[PDB]
Amino acid sequence: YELTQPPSVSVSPGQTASITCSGDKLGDKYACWYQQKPGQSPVLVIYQDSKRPSGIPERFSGSNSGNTATLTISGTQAMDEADYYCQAWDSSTSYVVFGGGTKLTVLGQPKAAPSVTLFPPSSEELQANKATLVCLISDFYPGAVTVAWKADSSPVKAGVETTTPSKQSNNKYAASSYLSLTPEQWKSHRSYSCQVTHEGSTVEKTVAPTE
């Protein structure tokens, strides 16, 4: 048994936002909805399909019919930006099931293209017989970006680790990607390049062993 949610849902402040939750004969069970802000525990915002716990704002409503439960937030506000999970406790087996979650973004500020800075391996690290390229991406909104590495327009296969976007102090987001190389393969290509894609717009930055 699986409960399947939309991965992401964005909404302007004040607009109505809806998150769906689909499962087999889900109408025949009760659905719960939980809100989780970053680095906080979950909180119950809807239970018994549609009931709202004590102290939960009235703009949170919920429905469940057929195979679809729906969490609705009318007049969506900045402080509602969070991950939302649905959950169902099967009346049989007494077996709990969460949804995959939904990242509700509240568009609170305008679009911002990322600022990409590519660092070649430090000479200390080279003297230590390793080489790490560092691609730092900063000052972008929304916080969603993809990274791609290349050696001379040829796409790099492995040795890449990339962070998920994180809020900086100015409420924008930043991410980092690292490419590991032996100093041989560092020195043995003309250049390396980091390609960063943000809302359909791609920017790349390049370094060379010479420069």
Partner: peptide
């Protein structure tokens, strides 16, 4: 303090963590 972002760490397949801090 200002202009500084310290990133979350990556867990390398080696099992060890690694991160970066940057300042504009």
């Amino acid at each position: 303090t200002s202009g500084v972002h310290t990133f979350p760490a990556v867990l390398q397949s080696s099992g060890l963590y690694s991160l970066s801090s940057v300042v504009t």
